Amino acid sequence: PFNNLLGSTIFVTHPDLKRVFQMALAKSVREILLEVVEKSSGIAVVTTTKIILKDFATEVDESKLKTAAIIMVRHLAQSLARATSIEPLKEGIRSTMQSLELDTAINENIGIALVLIEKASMDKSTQDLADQLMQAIAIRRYHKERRADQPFITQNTNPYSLSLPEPLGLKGVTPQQFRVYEEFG
């Protein structure tokens, strides 16, 4: 659609064919968009929820939880989106093209279509998580205001993480190094 479908030759540079091409991409996207986003984000928010809470059990400053919670589920969804959408999109993009050299043209412009299924599956992921992190975000607000100098959480289970060793395990608070791991990627 926008930005001329650059760069390419043929289908991009021929106006009559340019129209039916843009119509093929849009129909391709709208077809799998609903199917992909629901499933991908569904795995993203769940798999991050269980991971983050386990690792962050001793962590305070929900802003520091939110920061590492958001970027984890966002990037993980965007990665599961592109990977999921790539194959069926193209196969559909060609299938809807012949009905109404191809691979060379579409592989240049498949970037846009992918970016939408990413952006969409990301935002619904950041949403569904925030609603499911509410109880975990709230239970730390009470423990922040009501009891300050006290140790943190141990909400349900950390039986084997009660072990001693160096920062492969739960501490106090999460050290700057441990918080750096989930701070990047």
């Binding site: 798999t47 269980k50 991971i51 690792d55 990665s79 592109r82 160096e166 441990f178 791991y181």
Partner: protein, 260 residues
Amino acid sequence: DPNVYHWICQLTYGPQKEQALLELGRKREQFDDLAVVLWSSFGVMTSLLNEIISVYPMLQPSNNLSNRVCNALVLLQCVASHPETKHLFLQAHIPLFLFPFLNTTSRQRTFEYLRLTSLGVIGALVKNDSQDVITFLLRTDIVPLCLRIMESSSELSKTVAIFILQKILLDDVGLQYICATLERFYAVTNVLKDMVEHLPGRLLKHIIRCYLRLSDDLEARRLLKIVLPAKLRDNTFTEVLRDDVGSKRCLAQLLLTLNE
């Protein structure tokens, strides 16, 4: 013990971390532990998952990169099949990241090992016989995907594929999903029929096991009467079946269950 802590530390932070992945993978068979240590440890699961998700753009067609991620896969395979960490791993929706790997059709030795290692995880996930695993797997396109593997590619990956299926069929919930419809029934039967004609090996013992399982369902028991591969009814496989008692007792019963 304390050559492990340093490697795990490296895996999370320390620069090499492929060597550590290699080392820890080699020592994964001892102490009957470290499965819990891998899960309970901070940053490990996030890191192990990061190794996997870095292979996604590479799925367009490789090399040692495929060996690196394969080492992270056996690590996850170690986490799986461990009673403490199994249901935690399962309920954490981690294994669902291994399906795009399994979707790869490439027959290169690399992608052959990729799928093979990844198959080991799911195979280990069903190894301990837990019903919640089955009901989780049937949520997904796994069973049709295994069927793709069973007919083609490598005898090794096939042996893993037929095993995973046999486990699902063994469960009452799995035997319901398969053999629910003719579309799903004839999807599995034809492949099993193909492998028998296209055929010591374990592939035969598992195939017989699957038929004997499908012999339970009466609606399946009827259709199998006609749809049974004649090779099994014949004596063709007898010679190789003399060495396996269990395979013989299952095949004999399958024939006994067949007809009336």
